[PDB]
């Protein structure tokens, strides 16, 4: 059948035909007009049946020969006499309205369908999500139009409680009264709740127009909105999204689906609202402007397992208004004052004439209702009585079940309605159980309900008592919220690749991931020995800083809004912002380095760059408050973050805006100085004091209190306890500024010598210069080996791959390797003694020297890149060479487009030679630089310097070269000028930041270096190997300075959040929009105080009476 | 004083004060319409 | 995926048809650069035969591109294909080459010294000039890159805009 | 004039990337020396015997929904901004 429906659902066909009233209408001949008229006790006439039991029977009479014995006339019950058959009407209707083709899903089932079957159709076939609420609207039909305000409120509130609680508004479907007002309400607040509210009208197949059109198995069946000018029949309504078209008989009989609606009001009740929540899906009843049989239906609800409550809408109509007044004028839960029956029954009488026979019979259906006032609710329209029905409806299911507030809260948690929990569940007098808000917190954290995690903390939930090991294990092992599916791909990549099917994640496995995403020497709290013991054994199972364990959780589970919540809570804000930037940055890299449908890396890198900006904006906040303590905030050991450092975490994530921030750049400036005050010293005197040692003792050093914000070495800090003479030398030579200038002078003296050796005759044996030069490069290479070993992450391959990423460190290896090839050939070569350069081993050795020296001039740009002005130009040069590449490839093609025709036209008689690869490229290249070769153009001229090249076709070449230079000089060189002019500012801005960023790695490399430059360094190397087989900088605070610093951190985070709102709130965009919203509210009130005074001036001539 | 930043912000502050008063004159008149059926006695 | 399916997936990818044509085109210029820089004897060398074959079949392809193009009106297919810059260059480049080959190959070699026959010279000098079309056509291959290609289109938009400065 | 010719040339470049890529679906597999085989084989199968997007009928349904849903979000978000 290719439809789950047809195998399952059916219709009803009235197989059996029975008489009507038995009166043939008029018109004496009775036998055939019996065929013309006789509405079966079905309700359709004999011929409208078309049934196969009744198709070849009208020939004789029909079913049931003769009178059939009046008793047996009273025997048609559809059960025996109407057949279940395959559906014939399920599809998608379409409404003809402005730009909305509004769709639905009609089914056409028999009323006998099992209630399980219905819910299945709704959920799997129609692919609907189980609702968090069901608002079953019951009212009267053809209720013309409600007053303008009362339609606005019941039109905003029903939509607001259905868009926020994902609810199914069960209805009647007929475009008259209830469904008519529900639909208009939808249309007045559509397109914000469009694909969120699912409105199922349960209509009969009786009172239904274009009934024959809806027939058609699996169709896009059409439908109209032109109300049939004559008909009492009813049309389905525009905005209802689904339809249950029950069938038992025919037209009329609008009472066979009432039982099926009740089934769906039950079967949803037995489903759990959420996988974690034990409460069933709620069901509420909304009465507005009802009927005579409403108050009957109301009675049924409040007498069931459990009592489906009722929210009545007074001020709209008759039954609501009746039911409004009666339960309002009731005893607390019971009878009335001195008999109120006179007014009540009179009140009941005017709506509906009953008249003491059954106007009393209402008083019984009207007593048990008001006796159940606790379950009944009423929205007093026009009295701000719970702020449209959304509060009232949702409230109705919390107050009227005498339920625990645990269940009342959790319902709000599944609804995501914090206001209803904070204004009706956390109200004064509420008394909670020992750990019930904890179970709410556990559900809010898993369900990613940040706004309840806020509330549960604000009330009393301590995350120190809350957060334990076995619980925080659960939080990783959930699928009941927003998840990072990569956390398993990461936990796989650390646990050797094997994940058993269960594999309940362990915190030790999370610690291994945090070590891998944070890189280097990071050691998490979970991988330590002290945790692997308490863990496998299982206050001690409670973590000391819980909100640092959940910040990581929220990040590893890719829960930014929870991460951007738990970050404000707790201490070490700037640290956690730089960790998170690092976790997301590594999570992002491993997402791009993997195969997956959703890349989830532009999401993670943005998440990383969101916390990276929080750290910078807190640094700018601390720096604007105190500069000295802000620099201390960059270098204190964290002690919950692997003894790391907020700066070290930023350098780990290449978070350049933080390292290029003026605070770090000023600390970096102060670590460069050392104990020397270069504000009352000059570079002349540092150089002078390197060459004149006793001039070290005439320059200004820095006190211990001008060195407290500066991370130091231990030995350096041990000489802040006392300045004596030998201490004053240890302060000079160990400053990074001095190690620099003490290396530059050796390096400049090195080039002066190596320039001399390369320009002067090189004899058999190396001269004293060339020995001094080899010694430098030899020991300089030992230093680079030592730099690589004593670097960072113990994996030999990592230290390698880092050091070979800098430009000049690649050049250093070529420069060092090439020099000792050249020395091997130079020194290892048999001198000829007739004349040098007859030995080609010797020549090759020298020519490597003459080329190796180019590496060593270009390395001066690394020394010159220490200046604030020069260095950004040096980095800039390379960023431009990379960006001008494709312009220069075009310039190389125009070159060959010219050199090959020229060489071919001017030298026709050439055999193949390697000189043909020079001559196609040589002169055309030197033309780019202004050499025109004027007397080689027009080789047939008299002034020509190539008179023998004159021959056939050579008159073409001056035309060719005229085009060539026009292209190269007038187009391509000036296009490259234009390139540089329009890319200058942005490469200069990048190069300033990359310069400021790499000033960390540079300055911090000159703390670790020995004191002696690369010729005499070997002493320092040897001394460091002696004390290796015989025996970086840190910020030392006393315990009171750590206190004063954690205060300063806290105080500056407060000023950050305070000043962020004070700016947002004090902005014209915010002041226009709240002004906008107040003038709305006022205007409403001004046309209501304006109404009241219009009801006062009428009361000047009435009181006059 | 004749700038939009200054005219939006004092307008902002007046609409606050008014709204307070409009929901107080709106309260008083709610204590007048009760005094149509009491004076009726 | 089975083996013969895995080859049909490689060779029919547009990326592969590109690089499989570039290597033939770069190998084509390397040969046609060689023929034009080296002595050209009475009969074409194996290079120059490989070179003619390319341009001959390359022209059959362009004819096939025009037929199997779009709107069945022969004149429309024509007017579309002659609107691209390099497709105009391709016709001059193809037509000019077979003039030069007709004069080069159709010419009585002198046997005393070449370039005493001016039909032969004219044939070679067309080759030496026709090759300029075929270097500039590499800018069509280089214009496949996201960075290079906008510079190539840019050059021409600037030549048109600098015109009146250059007339002064 | 650099910035505005560079902006035009990026767009004209992106635009002509259709005609270029779609020309290399129709081309034979063999480059212009050995193409003649592919030409001959295509004349043999001419006297002896472009790209399209194939959806199943449920993927056409899911696509017409996606079209409708995105037009709604367009008009909704245009007024919500105005
Ligand atoms: C970041 C840090 C990275 C570090 C990177 C470091 C990388 C270092 C890289 C090093 C590569 C070194 C390559 C040298 C090439 C030698 C070849 C040569 O000259 O052969 C000639 C000499 O042959 C001899 O046997 C000469 C022996 C005496 C001289 C000693 C050589 C000193 C080598 C230096 C040691 C360097 C110390 C390195 C210290 C670091 C042969 O020619 P011939 O003699 O004219 O003819 C012989 C023919 N016959 C036999 C037929 C007669
Ligand atoms: C990122 C940067 C990477 C580089 C990228 C670019 C690649 C650069 C590649 C260029 C190709 C060069 C190939 C050389 C050919 C063989 C040379 C030879 O045999 O001997 C010559 C080598 O001695 C010289 O003096 C000439 C060396 C060439 C200088 C190049 C300058 C122009 C730069 C061009 C830049 C534009 C390139 C345009 C695009 C192609 C000497 O003379 P000969 O007659 O040839 O032979 C000896 C005979 N004789 C003694 C009788 C004289
Ligand atoms: C603004 C100023 C211009 C005025 C306007 C009027 C135009 C005036 C032109 C007129 C052309 C007629 C001149 C020929 C003279 C006789 C033959 C002769 O001596 O030939 C000589 C060369 O020249 C040639 O071989 C032919 C040159 C043709 C190209 C001229 C430019 C065409 C117009 C513009 C093209 C631009 C692009 C077009 C698109 C815009 C041979 O002498 P040789 O070379 O010294 O070698 C002799 C020695 N040998 C025997 C050993 C080889
Ligand atoms: C998008 C796609 C577009 C397609 C565009 C394609 C366009 C193609 C365009 C083609 C134009 C071709 C022009 C060629 C010029 C010939 C003139 C010539 O050389 O004459 C000489 C040779 O005269 C001969 O008769 C030579 C005969 C032998 C050689 C064969 C010629 C091959 C032609 C190639 C066929 C090309 C195949 C083309 C394939 C495509 C005469 O000089 P002479 O002999 O010294 O003197 C004679 C006078 N006497 C008798 C007094 C002595
Ligand atoms: C590894 C780290 C090194 C650091 C440096 C420490 C080591 C440096 C110390 C000593 C090394 C030098 C040893 C000299 C031995 C004598 C040489 C000789 O015979 O004569 C030479 C003398 O010497 C010079 O003229 C100097 C040669 C080097 C050039 C410049 C060195 C400056 C850099 C380093 C110092 C400043 C540093 C600056 C910093 C800003 C040349 O003699 P002449 O008179 O020209 O010959 C006549 C010519 N005629 C034949 C044509 C007539
Ligand atoms: C790990 C890094 C790579 C290292 C690579 C290995 C480097 C070492 C390489 C090679 C080892 C040295 C070979 C020894 C020479 C044998 C011939 C000989 O004895 O003498 C002959 C030398 O004839 C020549 O042509 C010498 C040319 C030497 C230079 C080439 C090496 C360039 C290295 C590239 C730069 C790399 C820089 C580093 C790049 C990072 C002739 O001289 P003779 O014999 O005295 O007398 C004449 C006799 N005869 C005329 C009859 C011939
Ligand atoms: C026996 C020997 C006697 C003495 C020898 C004397 C030797 C003299 C040695 C050097 C000359 C330079 C002296 C000026 C220094 C100024 C101060 C300074 O530090 O400025 C900067 C230079 O920082 C550097 O690192 C400069 C490195 C220079 C080496 C490059 C040479 C260029 C060669 C290529 C040219 C070819 C031509 C070469 C010639 C053929 C760094 O400062 P900053 O980072 O801005 O910090 C201050 C910031 N503030 C202002 C905000 C506070
Ligand atoms: C003999 C003596 C000569 C004079 C000595 C001169 C010494 C040199 C002087 C100064 C050197 C300048 C310092 C560089 C600073 C670091 C830059 C760096 O790390 O790499 C930069 C790139 O890579 C380069 O820029 C490579 C180095 C450029 C040297 C220029 C050589 C051009 C010659 C060849 C042509 C010659 C033609 C003829 C052929 C024969 C950084 O680029 P980026 O943008 O940050 O990132 C790249 C990635 N991207 C592509 C995605 C963007
Ligand atoms: C149409 C599609 C083409 C596609 C390519 C497939 C076809 C290509 C295959 C084959 C064609 C070549 C046939 C060779 C026949 C022998 C020639 C001969 O006699 O000697 C020549 C040898 O040959 C060369 O040196 C090669 C000549 C062409 C240069 C370019 C080759 C690279 C291009 C294509 C391939 C690269 C791929 C490109 C991809 C990046 C020269 O000899 P010599 O030793 O120099 O002479 C001594 C000189 N002396 C006399 C002065 C002493
Ligand atoms: C459809 C496209 C256009 C096609 C155009 C038609 C093309 C074909 C054109 C012409 C046909 C070829 C003529 C044959 C030669 C007759 C003379 C002769 O026998 O030889 C003489 C040649 O003397 C010369 O001057 C030769 C010059 C030939 C080059 C001119 C054509 C350029 C085409 C423009 C480029 C167009 C490229 C395409 C542009 C898109 C001399 O040699 P000889 O006789 O052996 O001996 C000496 C005798 N004598 C000294 C006594 C004299
Ligand atoms: C037997 C043979 C052995 C092998 C032979 C090897 C042959 C080597 C062949 C070619 C060399 C180039 C290799 C680099 C390719 C890089 C990748 C690429 O596709 O980049 C681009 C190049 O796209 C092109 O179409 C490039 C065309 C190059 C041909 C022009 C030569 C210029 C010559 C003039 C100079 C004269 C000097 C010439 C020398 C005298 C396209 O990529 P994209 O569009 O950006 O897509 C990626 C986008 N993404 C980054 C967002 C993902
Ligand atoms: C021998 C070898 C030499 C070197 C070879 C070099 C090879 C060439 C190198 C690179 C070629 C660049 C690729 C072009 C890209 C496509 C552009 C295009 O389609 O047309 C562009 C225009 O038209 C042109 O730009 C025409 C081509 C310009 C070539 C420059 C020749 C100048 C020399 C002559 C002077 C020489 C003086 C001396 C005289 C004797 C598009 O323009 P547009 O703006 O989009 O629209 C135009 C309409 N508008 C006007 C209304 C705006």
Layout: helices, strands, pairs:
The structure is cut from a larger assembly and holds four copies of chain A.
Chain A: H1 4-8, E1 10-13, H2 33-37, H3 46-49, H4 78-81, E2 83-86, E3 89-91, H5 115-125, E4 135-138, H6 148-163, E5 168-171, H7 178-188, E6 198-204, H8 211-214, E7 216-219, E8 242-246, H9 258-267, E9 284-288, H10 294-301, E10 310-313, H11 319-328, H12 341-351, H13 359-365, H14 367-371, E11 376-378, H15 388-399, H16 405-415, H17 418-424, H18 436-446, H19 450-459, H20 463-466, H21 469-476, H22 486-494, H23 507-518, H24 529-537, H25 546-556, H26 560-566, H27 573-592, H28 602-625, H29 627-632, H30 646-652, H31 656-659, H32 662-673, H33 683-691, H34 714-718, H35 725-733, H36 736-759, H37 768-789, H38 796-803, H39 807-827, H40 840-858, H41 860-864, H42 870-883, H43 885-906, H44 915-919, H45 922-926, H46 957-1008, H47 1017-1026, H48 1039-1065, H49 1068-1094
Parallel strand pairs in A: 3-7, 4-9, 5-6, 6-8, 9-10, 10-11
Antiparallel strand pairs in A: 1-2
């Amino acid at each position: 059948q290719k439809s789950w429906i047809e195998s399952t659902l059916t219709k009803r066909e009235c197989v059996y035909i029975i008489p009507s009233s038995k009166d043939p209408h008029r018109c004496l001949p009775g036998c055939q007009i019996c065929q013309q008229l006789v509405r079966c006790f079905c309700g359709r006439l004999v011929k409208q049946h078309a049934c196969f039991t009744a198709s070849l029977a009208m020939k004789y009479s029909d079913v049931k020969l003769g009178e059939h014995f009046n008793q047996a006339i009273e025997e048609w019950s559809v059960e025996k006499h109407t057949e279940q058959s395959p559906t014939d009407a399920y599809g998608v209707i379409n409404f003809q309205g402005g730009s909305h083709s509004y769709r639905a899903k009609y089914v056409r089932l028999s009323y006998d369908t099992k209630p399980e079957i219905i819910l299945q159709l709704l959920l799997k076939e129609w692919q609907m999500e189980l609702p968090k609420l069901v608002i079953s609207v019951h009212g009267g039909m053809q209720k013309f139009e409600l007053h303008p305000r009362i339609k606005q409120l019941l039109g905003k509130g029903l939509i607001k409680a259905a868009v926020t609680t994902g609810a199914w508004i069960l209805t009647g479907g007929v475009n008259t009264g209830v469904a008519k007002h529900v639909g208009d309400a939808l249309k007045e607040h559509a397109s914000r709740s469009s694909r969120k509210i699912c409105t199922i009208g349960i209509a009969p197949w009786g009172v239904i127009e274009n009934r024959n059109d809806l027939v058609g198995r699996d169709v896009v069946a059409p439908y109209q909105t032109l109300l049939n000018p004559l008909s009492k029949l009813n049309v389905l309504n525009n905005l209802h999204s689904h339809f249950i078209l029950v069938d038992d008989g025919t037209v009329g009989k609008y009472g066979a689906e009432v039982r099926l609606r009740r089934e769906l009001e039950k079967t949803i009740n037995q489903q759990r609202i959420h996988a974690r929540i034990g409460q069933g899906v709620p069901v509420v009843a909304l009465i507005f402007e009802g009927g005579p049989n409403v108050i009957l239906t109301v009675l049924e609800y409040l007498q069931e397992s459990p009592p489906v409550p009722v929210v009545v809408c007074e001020g709209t109509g008759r039954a609501a208004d009746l039911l409004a007044y009666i339960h309002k004028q009731t005893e607390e839960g019971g009878n009335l004052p001195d008999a109120a029956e006179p007014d009540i029954i009179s009140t009941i009488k005017k709506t509906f004439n009953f008249g003491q026979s059954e106007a009393v019979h209402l008083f019984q259906t009207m007593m048990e209702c008001m006796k159940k006032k606790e379950l009944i609710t009423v929205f007093h329209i026009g009295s701000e009585d719970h702020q449209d029905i959304d509060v009232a409806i949702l409230t109705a299911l919390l107050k009227g079940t005498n339920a625990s507030a645990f269940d009342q809260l959790i319902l709000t948690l599944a609804w995501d309605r914090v206001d209803i929990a904070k204004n009706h569940v956390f109200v004064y007098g509420q008394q909670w159980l020992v750990g019930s808000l904890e179970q709410a917190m556990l559900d809010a954290l898993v369900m990613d309900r940040v706004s309840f995690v806020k509330l549960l903390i604000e009330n009393g939930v301590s995350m120190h008592k809350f957060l334990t090991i076995p619980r925080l294990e659960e939080l990783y092992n959930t699928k009941q919220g927003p998840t990072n599916p990569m956390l398993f791909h990461l936990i796989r990549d650390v646990k050797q690749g094997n994940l058993p099917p269960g594999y309940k994640i362990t915190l030790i496995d999370i610690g291994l991931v945090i070590e891998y995403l944070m890189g280097g020497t990071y050691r998490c709290t979970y991988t330590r020995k002290r945790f692997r013991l308490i863990y496998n054994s299982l206050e001690t199972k409670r973590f000391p800083y819980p909100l640092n364990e959940l910040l990581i959780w929220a990040c590893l589970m890719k829960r930014q809004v929870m991460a951007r919540f738990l970050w404000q809570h707790g201490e070490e804000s700037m640290a956690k912002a730089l960790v998170a930037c690092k976790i997301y940055r590594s999570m992002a890299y491993e997402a791009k380095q993997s195969d997956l449908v959703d890349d989830t890396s532009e999401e993670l890198k943005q998440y990383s760059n969101d916390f990276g900006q929080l750290a910078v904006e807190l640094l700018e906040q601390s720096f604007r408050q105190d500069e000295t303590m802000a620099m201390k905030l960059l270098t204190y050991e964290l002690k919950n973050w692997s003894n790391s450092t907020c700066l070290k975490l930023a350098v780990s994530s290449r978070l350049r805006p933080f390292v290029a921030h003026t605070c770090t750049q000023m600390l970096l400036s102060d670590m460069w100085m050392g104990r020397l005050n270069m504000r009352k010293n000059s570079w002349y005197k540092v150089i002078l004091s390197i060459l004149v040692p006793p001039a070290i003792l005439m320059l200004e050093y820095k006190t211990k209190a001008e060195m407290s914000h500066i991370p130091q070495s231990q030995d350096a800090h041990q000489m802040t306890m006392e300045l004596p003479i030998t201490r004053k030398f240890y302060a000079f030579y160990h400053a990074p500024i001095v190690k620099f200038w003490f290396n530059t002078l050796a390096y400049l003296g090195f080039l002066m010598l190596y320039t001399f050796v390369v320009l002067v005759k090189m004899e058999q044996l190396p001269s004293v210069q060339e020995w001094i030069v080899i010694a430098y490069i030899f020991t300089y290479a030992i230093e680079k080996v030592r730099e690589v070993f004593m670097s960072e992450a113990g994996k030999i391959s990592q230290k390698i791959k880092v050091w070979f990423s800098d430009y000049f460190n690649v050049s250093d290896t070529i420069a060092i390797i090439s020099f000792f090839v050249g020395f091997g050939l130079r020194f290892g070569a048999k001198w000829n003694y007739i004349n040098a350069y007859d030995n080609h081993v010797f020549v090759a050795g020298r020519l490597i020297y003459c080329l190796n020296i180019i590496f060593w001039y270009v390395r001066l740009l690394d020394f010159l890149a220490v200046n604030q002005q020069a260095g950004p130009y040096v980095m800039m040069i390379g960023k431009m060479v990379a960006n001008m590449f494709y312009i220069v490839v075009i310039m190389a093609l125009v070159l060959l487009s010219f050199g090959v025709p020229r060489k071919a036209i001017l030298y026709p008689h050439e055999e193949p030679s390697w000189s043909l690869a020079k001559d196609i490229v040589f002169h055309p290249y030197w033309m780019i630089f202004g050499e025109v070769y004027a007397y080689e153009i027009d080789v047939c001229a008299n002034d020509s310097t190539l008179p023998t090249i004159c021959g056939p076709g050579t008159w073409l070449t001056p035309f060719l070269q005229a085009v060539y230079l026009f292209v190269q000089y007038i187009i391509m060189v000036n296009l490259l000028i234009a390139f540089f002019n329009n890319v200058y500012l942005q490469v200069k801005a990048i190069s300033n930041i990359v310069w400021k960023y790499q000033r960390y790695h540079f300055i911090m490399a000159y703390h670790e270096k020995p004191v002696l430059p690369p010729p005499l360094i070997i002493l320092s190397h040897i001394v460091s190997l002696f004390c290796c087989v015989c025996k970086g900088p840190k910020l030392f605070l006393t315990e009171e300075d750590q206190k004063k610093l954690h205060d300063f951190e806290e105080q500056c985070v407060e000023m950050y959040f305070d000043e962020k709102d004070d700016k947002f709130n004090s902005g014209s965009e915010e002041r226009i929009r709240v002004t906008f919203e107040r003038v709305e509210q006022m205007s409403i009130q001004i046309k209501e105080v304006g109404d009241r005074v219009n009801y006062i001036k009428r009361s000047l001539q009435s009181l006059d009476s």
